[PDB]
Automatic annotation (TrEMBL), chain D:
It is found in: Cytoplasm. Its EC number is 2.4.2.8. The chain holds residues 24 to 216 of 241 of the full protein. Belongs to the purine/pyrimidine phosphoribosyltransferase family. Its cofactor is Mg(2+). One of its GO terms (cellular component) is cytosol. One of its GO terms (biological process) is hypoxanthine metabolic process. This is Hypoxanthine phosphoribosyltransferase. Residues 17-169 form the Phosphoribosyltransferase domain. It catalyses: IMP + diphosphate = hypoxanthine + 5-phospho-alpha-D-ribose 1-diphosphate. IMP binds at residues 108-109, 112-114, 116-117, 140, 161-162. Converts guanine to guanosine monophosphate, and hypoxanthine to inosine monophosphate. Transfers the 5-phosphoribosyl group from 5-phosphoribosylpyrophosphate onto the purine. Plays a central role in the generation of purine nucleotides through the purine salvage pathway. Pathway: Purine metabolism; IMP biosynthesis via salvage pathway; IMP from hypoxanthine: step 1/1.
């Protein structure tokens, strides 16, 4: 009984999404129980990629806190070199991390991986900085869309190819604030591209 | 329950209750203003790092009230002065879209001195939004060194090591669901 | 002499430009001899706006050194929000200064001022940071084009409205490396606007 | 003449002579490559701060040899170590255009350990330029902690406090026309402050 005129259907309710986030966080806590994480000196660093991941991250890190996984939050932001071309997957860095990741355990946090061109690019970039470990967690995975092989370590949910909006995800910087992940109506998409 | 914490100021639930009230208050203030998606959203300029969690919950609460928003994130850092009287900060990351002619709400985590907030407000004003307001998670009014009234306040506090819900000590404890008071012992160590 | 197929004419040779840079610098030295400038503690801070000013700045600060004016270089960079053009003059900050300007003597260095919408925006921004003083120097002044009143304190040269290129100035990020400031042929402009289609 | 300087390593004029030589060498290396303005320029990624003055002169000299260029500037800063083995740095400002498919020349002021330069090279490489070289103003090869050869070098130096021509000490002396050696006394006195 959350309803949206602009959406064909709902894919994931807030609650479904929170349940999966809890499951992903449990797994993470488990995979890192061996690594002796500690606040200040050795937290799991969450490199959250803006804007899309801002919501996922806010929910994810509280779920992580529930499993006593201590975390350091970093926020980066990158922008497309508006080509369409790019097989390097290259993006423009607009905000890089405040602290060194070297020797720390890092988790890159992203909202959507389809092509993985950009995630792969950012994985490689942060890998060459010699963190103790480096893994990826993604809100949505659209494996159908890969142009470079890449497996996220953690996945909240899989999706097919559609205009996916909400829960931080946007169409034209709109609809990020929805509590649910929903499928944008093609008519709404078409009407907005005319404008 | 938290070993490093003197006490719990606000539980997650209290916090979400206040945020819903603030959200309703905003929805009421902007109903005359004709907000519309794409063309006229309320722009939230969320100041990193401390406001990230507040902003995630706040924009969802605003969505419950059919307030269409646009999310922008900016990031500033301190110049290594003991303390500055202009409230100047270094711009690391700035809005993606122009704010000219839009309704803008700046979202901050904590306001004490307001020097920084006043500087940002003034900067954002000269950019000619249709209107500008600020919402803050925690107001420490005791602390002001410049005159500044937040339009929306989630909760007032005294002076204290306040951590949790996005707020840090040495980039630690931002992940907590509650806002809590640090032990001075843990601070000293 | 240098020659260029893509240019209607030369407006300023390298040597013409260096002479005016020297004259400007002498003036700056003279205006600040009273202010007790000193290296490390109290230099004249040059806020150089990229990309356009890079070459101007490199030449200007050597000239300033010739008149014993100690300087600190800062480089900022900003980008247009893709509004055709806006009345606030607002731009996006991509790179801000490394050190505080509070209490320092600051000179903002720009390549071209026409509307002054953006330079006014940047003057105001740095002014509210409370430097000891804040002035502007511009390579080229197109006073004809103002949409906000604004007077640069120092001007290397005035120009009329033309595609001005060279000496750091670009068309489509091309021709910045020229030693001279020249006028781009409208035919070349038209050929290039069609081409990215 | 400069009171704060033991000696002059290179005069402005010597520097311009070397830069002209390096520029010729580049113009020769890329003649087979079909550089053209707008569509296929040699992209100079000039690293701020210290390379600003070199970059200004170098691109003018390159223009003398009809080498079409695109100027990009990047700016990075140190993470709070003494130093680091990955040679990582923090990205503050990045290129405006993509470097995919272009010929790229990275322009640096000074290479000692090469850790930073090695990291930038590698990052830029993964961006798939058609080709990638580096040109440096001063090479301090004695100091390498990772193997790296600059393709173009304006001048080699020993180990010294080197200042001028864009190179600084505590963000001072970048404006000098010559490259000069700092007096250690001047160094000690300022460290005090």
């Amino acid at each position: 009984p959350r309803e949206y005129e602009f959406a064909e259907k709902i894919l994931f309710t807030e609650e479904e999404i929170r349940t999966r986030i809890k499951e992903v966080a449990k797994r993470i806590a488990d995979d890192y129980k061996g690594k002796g994480l500690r606040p200040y000196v050795n937290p799991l660093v969450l490199i959250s990629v803006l804007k899309g991941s801002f919501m996922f991250t806010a929910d994810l890190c509280r779920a992580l806190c529930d499993f006593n996984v201590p975390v350091r939050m970093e926020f980066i932001c990158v922008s497309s070199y508006g080509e369409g071309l790019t097989s390097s997957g290259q993006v423009r860095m607009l905000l890089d991390t405040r602290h060194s990741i070297e020797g720390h355990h890092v988790l890159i946090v992203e909202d959507i991986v389809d092509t993985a061109l950009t995630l792969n690019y950012l994985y490689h970039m942060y890998f060459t900085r010699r963190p103790a470990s480096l893994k990826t967690v993604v809100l949505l995975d659209k494996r159908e869309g890969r142009r470079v092989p890449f497996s996220a370590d953690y996945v909240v949910a899989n999706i097919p190819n559609a205009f996916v909006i909400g829960y931080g995800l946007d169409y034209d910087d709109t609809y990020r604030e929805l509590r649910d992940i929903v499928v944008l109506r093609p008519e709404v998409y078409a009407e907005r591209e005319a404008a």
